[PDB]
Ligand binder design. Structure first.
Ligand SMILES: *[C@@H]1O[C@H](CO)[C@@H](O[C@@H]2O[C@H](CO)[C@@H](O)[C@H](O)[C@H]2NC(C)=O)[C@H](O)[C@H]1NC(C)=O
Ligand SMILES: *[C@@H]1O[C@H](CO)[C@@H](O[C@@H]2O[C@H](CO)[C@@H](O)[C@H](O)[C@H]2NC(C)=O)[C@H](O)[C@H]1NC(C)=O
Ligand SMILES: *[C@@H]1O[C@H](CO)[C@@H](O[C@@H]2O[C@H](CO)[C@@H](O)[C@H](O)[C@H]2NC(C)=O)[C@H](O)[C@H]1NC(C)=O
Ligand SMILES: *[C@@H]1O[C@H](CO)[C@@H](O)[C@H](O)[C@H]1NC(C)=O
Ligand SMILES: *[C@@H]1O[C@H](CO)[C@@H](O)[C@H](O)[C@H]1NC(C)=O
Ligand SMILES: *[C@@H]1O[C@H](CO)[C@@H](O)[C@H](O)[C@H]1NC(C)=O
Ligand SMILES: *[C@@H]1O[C@H](CO)[C@@H](O)[C@H](O)[C@H]1NC(C)=O
Ligand SMILES: *[C@@H]1O[C@H](CO)[C@@H](O)[C@H](O)[C@H]1NC(C)=O
Ligand SMILES: *[C@@H]1O[C@H](CO)[C@@H](O)[C@H](O)[C@H]1NC(C)=O
Ligand SMILES: *[C@@H]1O[C@H](CO)[C@@H](O)[C@H](O)[C@H]1NC(C)=O
Ligand SMILES: *[C@@H]1O[C@H](CO)[C@@H](O)[C@H](O)[C@H]1NC(C)=O
Ligand SMILES: *[C@@H]1O[C@H](CO)[C@@H](O)[C@H](O)[C@H]1NC(C)=O
Lengths: 600, 600, 600
């Protein structure tokens, strides 16, 4: 440590303390509006409905009878459709099916007879039980073959009337549908003759379709004849007859599917966009502040009904006796393709402002389909960031406000501490060792000059020999400003300060014990006499500072993770059409010669 | 700035400082228990096993020989199954296959002869090589056709014995399985006659299935006869014969699949649920504190074996010489459908508490299948929030504790600063300019009255005319409480304070230089004489406050993002069954007349 | 509250305050390098190209004419390929197709004639319109059947030349491709005779493939003859002829697909790995600091072109007049399987350092395919954690630095407060009630002894009877160190301190009003006479502490959430190959007897 010599400060330089600053204002709280919400997503599930398929499994086989064996020289298999007359007057009316298959095939009016015998009404019976299969009924199980006749190619016909209940599936624009057997029906499931249903798509002749009003279906297993009538549609395809109940299109299909029902969906406005955050599901959405026209959604007649039902149910369940509805439900299109049906609410404690919020809330040729993203993590991350960033910022603001107040509060103490020891207060505030004097309401300063530690010596005795009973308050010292400069009489001061005047006089008292700072340690005195030097660590130390142990957040590495890779999902299927077709089509190239030609 | 006049305070009002407050206690550290863990997920991969399929590709064609050409009037193709007798005594025993196909078709015992010749044992040879295909063997490559005979419809038969090795797949409940060729086998892969295997599902007659004990398979390419025996199952379907090795069901299939092996899985208890957090994978799970009964998992025999093996391996690898096992492994069902197999551990430094942790850890008719969610982000977000919320809260608590300690620590300084300048300390603490007096251990206060800045004037000199050598410590002033009120003799004080007594007298000294606050600036004096006024900015300013630059966290917007949209995943398939079927079934409506009828 | 008695401190024990500590240094700012970036992902989309398929729908049917009906005894259907000669000289050259189908089937040169008549060139016309179907042309719509002849089995042939435009798809290694009709073509789409194309895969004889140079395609609907030539490839499969334009393999396929184009991709280096963070998409990647050799990517010729094009476009759009390019683009393989093409940039304000950054940036036998993960949440979570952890740590560091500076700053006040009241400052710093004395630059301490509250009594008056006009500054007291010990004369002090000397004398003054702390309250005096006792709450209290209201972050629970479960995605398909095949193959077991045999 170096010593310092400071001359008497004068008015050549003055300094003052900074006045209290204006601390930051508390940020305004965000305006959150409570309300119920329902989130909708793009509908990807095909329209499903029940249908009945009627057809006759006609088959004729040619058999060759050898001397001691029989061989099948050819087996022809074909599916024949059941006409409307039969499906209405025999199967449905009596549960019987004609044994003759009459239909058009390859532009020819072909006819077949079961066992080549005369026509006869055959009873329909349930088919053999099978696990995970819909109900089905048939009329014949044993295939008919010609009788044995040595050396002849005889023929035998078999007609097996079959009726089955299959699940039909359809997708947008719902212009066609498939059946459980994989057969395609190029006709809209909603095609008909009533209420503009004739405008639907149809790829068959007008005579191939028939609609029956007031149709009473008759179950085949149980012979009941239904309880209420229905509008039955019947189509005769080239290979089968399919029948299904007709229903209106608009209230039967919907392009949007209800995804979540949020009980508490807080909505805030900032940055020109609403923020719908749900604490229950931990998700945050963003819109454009303009209600999405619900009429623009193609086939979106289910959105309003489902939204209103869910809103009423949730309101009656929770907000029945605590809040009130403010305006009709609002619809907004959130980022990512999510349609949100919002319902603002207001607490009963401040219902007087209902008239002011109603009108403000009410202020918020073609159709299209909303495309919803397959990942919601973009919204969950937004909520997580907001859930942490918002509270952290609040605490940071409070710390800054409190810190500023503390500094202004301490200005009072410094105003008084400076008068007690201007040299110490001026040195720490100015940033360098300087002597100061109180020139009224402002303080003057003068820079000190350092002195080497080896260029100072302390007089052993502080006793003033001049007057007995008179002693000095600090030890006397001799110091040379230079390494070999003339020594300069002086007195020791506080904090290694060297004053050039031995004016600090005090009456000598018995039992004098003192310690004075000197360089990097202290100088011990006893009875006004120098005893010895001692290091700084020789005295017990007490920490006057408040310990704070802030620890930074450790870095983290997020490794990739997936529950099921895309390869695992693909492998989950029992059968693969691509692999099955590739292997099956290689049969000819593997087990046969595809180029050799034999002729004679 | 306004001036203030304060009267002598009296005992009419007193005030004291608040005593030190009790700072918050440090929150108790969370109880984390180390241990190894294994996470299981719902098994979606079908059960895969190897199987061999035997069948004869029987085909008979009718050829019409014209005057200068040949035409195929019809080609009949059918697959015939190989009986057990042949598969055991000819193919497996000698690698030969009979040239005659005898089987039941359409309820008729049909028979076919290769080339219409007598029966003969034909050798099996490998099929033509094909990329990405399993091994296969056949016996004939050239199709047989009748010899030319002008003007006749002649017939020719071809029997090609074919055997192939295909991959079989099955799914829960494993009551049936498929083959690489797309053929379905309605029989459980585990069906058999031993150890209750007969209770499995089977949709074929008892005579269509055969089991051979001690079966030694003979490879066809290499004529080796295997090294060890196996239990071979043989089923004769209506179109082919499939053979596969029989194995027990329970140790062959499992409804849960091992997903991750965590080396460090910290478990904590709070809120009535355990929290299994893994820092390695950055995932957090939640359970119900009750061990999930492992016996309730349907076909869950693999869970225990895999969990124990992984636990032992990880323990021997890392915790072999540092921790000890505490109790047997525990199983818990986490949210989302994840089964966690936990193994508590205890450090060797405190192994004496093993007896206390053992019993406590040990304290923690139908079956079902666990459904695992396809997204783990719900758990990763939980870990991320906890990984940030927990350390942030710890630092916030330390700041609050340290801040409270500092305030209590500073109470000592204010206890002494008030005695030096009661007016200043009382004004800042009370919140308004008030004069104070020290009435023992409590301080009195009196509110001051403001004075306009223009209603005060300073006397030019502080020299005492009636007593040379005596000067005033502050400049003299004259002020009127009102805008035009009688002026009131007074003296200037500290911080624009106006005292009503000129008692501050001091001996005049040469070189008098002072500055006194006056309104918004200062008043400079020299040799006890007014010099001029100067602004506050005219004096150098030093900031005694510690600058803190807290910056709030900027808002962020998370846009949607996906590596592969659901549409891209669907398009990844080489072939689509829906699109292929839709186009193929439109052939008749596109390239043919489906309504015109021709007759004569 | 307990009273305290402290003896005069001596030099037996001394204590000093801790000197100012070295506050932490501000952490160095992270080195972020601006630049443009392009992210690539694994290519899963199959290679798509247009192809034309030519084939003849040959069909011959056998009809049986009864006395009053007609029956189809068998219908043979087969697809015949169109030879190259016809496809080049009739269809393409004139739009006509021969009415005779000549081809090889079952190793026989079969021939068919339309309607059994002589050969004739038939015109090709467009097929019937169908929604969502490619163009197609045919030549016949009505099927031909034999004329009626009582009691006869007659045959009739129909040859319908059909040509269609289908979409071809292929996947890696591109050794085969499929068509829209589901047919497989075991030949590489890039097979040919020029520039080493003959090395591609091919599973057909050399005579089954033909390449035509300078081929001018002629549209069938519009009779235009194209505008430019092309290299046409022709393959004659066993059932059809497919033609497609030939193109080179390398510039036509790519194993990596451009995913995102980042305008601002900050790159930082720490921990031995680069961190590519994009604020626009909120994603962070990690690499190995070594540029991934672009030559190691199999069929990666598209990466360089796309990366350079995107880089140039983005640069010209934004960084054209503000930054400069530093070196050529760099390629790195990020975790998860993402290839990042980086382009470092440097601001124009410091372009002088270009020569120093250029060389440093430039310092950064087999092929493989990069496997990209299907989830990017691992990278988004990394960005979110870094986006919060980094700013939070910065503010925490500033608080710690500012807090340390404040403690060192307050050391000056304590250095002066100790001289005013050594007992109070020593008690709070040492931690226990101790009396202190100023032994120069160090302070001595002596522990006090507590005294019970009931063992002290205060005299009624402090009037000094011996000297009228002289009063005591504090009330006189009598206290016994023990419960029944001799009472000890004394005087009351500050903070319930009891001094053993009545030396605090002051001149009596009129209007004496004081309050002194006594136990848990105060003792009120008037005119140097005891008045009464009063509680601590009886005096108005003003809080001198700065209130901080830190609030911890509340816990949060993240419930599972998915937009579309894996089951919903599977159900989105209109048709399922597995379910369709399972039901179709059960037809025999459901509607027929598979074991009964009939013979005679
Ligand atoms: C919110 O409104 C903005 C416009 O203010 C929409 O952004 C526009 O979208 C159209 C779509 O055709 C683009 O052509 C425009 O270029 C976009 N404009 C801008 C300024 O970006 C945005 O799509 C709306 N968002 C939602 C969720 O509806
Ligand atoms: C944890 O235990 C709770 C009950 O304490 C389970 O919640 C119940 O689940 C059943 C399922 O049938 C419901 O019927 C009950 O209504 C639920 N009760 C409550 C209070 O919510 C919960 O499923 C258990 N969680 C796990 C992961 O096992
Ligand atoms: C980064 O480099 C490390 C090695 O420094 C790679 O890790 C090695 O990967 C090989 C792959 O065959 C393993 O066999 C080694 O055991 C791994 N070594 C270590 C030390 O883990 C790592 O794959 C590289 N990462 C990227 C993204 O390229
Ligand atoms: C919105 O916040 C402002 C303050 O920023 C407040 O005055 C106003 O009342 C709030 N409005 C609503 C509707 O909450
Ligand atoms: C809902 O509140 C109405 C009054 O507004 C009350 O009559 C009704 O019983 C309440 N229903 C429930 C379920 O609390
Ligand atoms: C601060 O924390 C560190 C790490 O726990 C510890 O070593 C140090 O002693 C602490 N300092 C205190 C409590 O003053
Ligand atoms: C749990 O924490 C408490 C303090 O909250 C502690 O006393 C106890 O020992 C801890 N127990 C375990 C098992 O860690
Ligand atoms: C594991 O510890 C055992 C003693 O408990 C020791 O014998 C063995 O060698 C150790 N194995 C390893 C791999 O460290
Ligand atoms: C606080 O930070 C702002 C922004 O960097 C800066 O402009 C200001 O000067 C800082 N104040 C300080 C360092 O006192
Ligand atoms: C990297 O940071 C160091 C300080 O840590 C700095 O000196 C150096 O200039 C920086 N380099 C670059 C390229 O930004
Ligand atoms: C880009 O900068 C060049 C000069 O470097 C200038 O000539 C050109 O016009 C600029 N282009 C744009 C689009 O700003
Ligand atoms: C601190 O916050 C709590 C909760 O808002 C409040 O009750 C308390 O009065 C606050 N203390 C203050 C502002 O001093």
């Amino acid at each position: 440590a170096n010593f310092y010599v400071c001359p008497p400060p004068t008015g050549a330089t003055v300094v003052q303390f900074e006045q209290p600053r204006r601390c930051p204002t508390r940020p305004e709280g965000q305006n959150y509006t409570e309300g119920i919400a329902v989130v909708f997503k793009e509908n990807i599930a095909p329209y499903k409905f029940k249908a009945t398929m009627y057809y006759k499994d006609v088959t004729v086989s040619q058999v060759w009878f050898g001397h001691r064996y029989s061989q099948f020289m050819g087996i022809f298999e074909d599916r024949a459709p059941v006409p409307f007359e039969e499906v209405i007057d025999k199967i449905n009316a009596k549960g019987v099916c004609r044994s003759t298959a009459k239909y058009v095939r390859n532009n020819l009016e072909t006819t077949a007879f079961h066992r080549d015998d005369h026509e006869t009404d055959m009873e329909l019976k349930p088919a053999n039980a099978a696990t995970r299969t819909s109900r089905g009924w048939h009329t014949t199980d044993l295939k008919y073959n010609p009788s044995r006749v040595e050396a002849f190619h005889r023929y035998g016909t078999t007609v097996n009337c079959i009726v089955e209940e299959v699940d039909a599936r359809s997708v947008y624009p719902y212009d066609e549908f498939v059946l459980a057997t994989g057969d395609f029906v190029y006709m809209s499931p909603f095609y008909g003759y009533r209420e503009g249903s004739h405008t639907e798509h149809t790829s068959y002749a007008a005579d191939r379709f028939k609609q029956v009003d007031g149709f009473y279906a008759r179950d085949l297993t149980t012979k009941a004849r239904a309880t209420a009538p229905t509008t039955r549609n019947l189509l005769t395809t080239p290979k089968f007859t399919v029948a299904w109940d007709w229903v209106p299109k608009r209230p039967s299909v919907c392009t949007m599917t209800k995804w979540q029902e949020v009980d508490e969906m807080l909505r805030s406005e900032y940055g020109g966009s609403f923020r719908f955050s749900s604490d229950a599901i931990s998700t945050t959405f963003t819109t454009n502040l303009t209600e999405y026209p619900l009429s623009r959604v193609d086939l979106g007649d289910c959105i309003g009904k489902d939204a209103r039902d869910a809103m009423d149910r949730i309101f009656a369940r929770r907000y029945n006796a605590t809040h009130i509805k403010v305006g009709q439900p609002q619809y907004y299109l959130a980022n990512g393709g999510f349609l949100i049906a919002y319902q603002p609410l207001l607490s009963n404690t401040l219902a007087e402002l209902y008239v002011r919020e109603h009108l403000r809330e009410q202020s918020r040729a073609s159709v299209e389909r909303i495309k919803t993203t397959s990942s919601i993590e973009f919204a969950r991350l937004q909520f997580t960031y907001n859930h942490i960033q918002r509270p952290v910022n609040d605490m940071l603001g409070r710390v800054a406000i409190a810190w500023c107040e503390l500094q202004n509060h301490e200005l009072t103490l410094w105003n008084e501490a400076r008068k007690l020891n201007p040299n110490a207060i001026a040195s720490v505030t100015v940033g360098r060792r300087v002597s100061a004097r109180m020139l009224g309401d402002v303080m003057a300063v003068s820079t000190c000059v350092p002195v080497a530690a080896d260029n100072v010596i302390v007089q052993n005795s502080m006793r003033i020999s001049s007057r007995p009973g008179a002693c000095y308050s600090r030890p006397l010292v001799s110091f040379r400003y230079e390494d070999q400069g003339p020594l300069v009489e002086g007195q020791l001061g506080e904090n290694n300060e060297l004053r050039l005047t031995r004016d600090a006089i005090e009456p000598c008292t018995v039992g004098h014990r003192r310690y004075f700072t000197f360089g990097g340690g202290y100088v011990y005195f006893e009875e006004y006499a120098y005893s010895h030097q001692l290091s700084r660590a020789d005295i017990t130390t007490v920490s006057t500072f408040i310990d704070l142990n802030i620890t930074m957040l450790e870095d983290h590495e997020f490794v990739p993770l997936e529950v099921y890779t895309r390869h695992e999902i693909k492998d989950s299927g029992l059968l693969d059409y691509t692999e099955v077709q590739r292997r099956n089509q290689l049969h000819d190239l593997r087990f046969a010669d595809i180029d050799t030609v034999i002729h004679a």
